[PDB]
């Protein structure tokens, strides 16, 4: 499952970079995600903080609530890349929090949960636009 694996790689890498501080298509997607994932947090820091508090994530594995949230976000039937990147960015915000409380925390369950929602529930929507190419082009700046 190339799309799942590619997506998980991009999302896992971003979450890990965010939480710790520390092919080419996947690379361009990750570069875009760094830029706009960081971008969407800007101005929304208070909102993200408030969401994190309500989310009340218990540990690295406690992803069920976030998954329900993500499914609910999409439950109006609208799908776009702004929503998707906001969910990933919030995921990174949550991952950063999990590491802050326990530095031995793995971001992997969170990244897998996010990727699951995106790839399983929007599979064909992603495939029709050649996956992450839609993301790269949507957020492409000249």
């Amino acid at each position: 499952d190339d799309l799942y694996r590619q997506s998980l790689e991009i999302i896992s890498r971003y979450l890990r970079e965010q939480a710790t501080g520390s092919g080419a298509a996947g690379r361009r997607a990750l570069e875009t995600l760094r830029r706009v994932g960081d971008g969407v947090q800007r101005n929304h820091e208070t909102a993200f903080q408030g969401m994190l508090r309500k989310l009340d994530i218990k540990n690295e594995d406690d992803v069920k609530s976030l998954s329900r949230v993500m499914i609910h976000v999409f439950s109006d039937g609208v799908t776009n890349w702004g929503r998707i990147v906001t969910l990933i960015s919030f995921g990174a915000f949550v991952a950063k929090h999990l590491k802050t409380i326990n530095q031995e925390s793995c971001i992997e369950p969170l990244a897998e949960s996010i990727t699951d929602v995106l790839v399983r529930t929007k599979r064909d929507w992603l495939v029709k636009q050649r996956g992450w190419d839609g993301f790269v082009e949507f957020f492409h700046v000249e």
Partner: peptide, 23 residues
């Protein structure tokens, strides 16, 4: 309610951010 509150805010921000880049 908490999950719905979180989802409402994520959707608002996502759609905002989408419109920003769609423009």
């Amino acid at each position: 309610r908490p999950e719905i509150w979180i989802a409402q805010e994520l959707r608002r921000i996502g759609d905002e951010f989408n419109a920003y880049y769609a423009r």
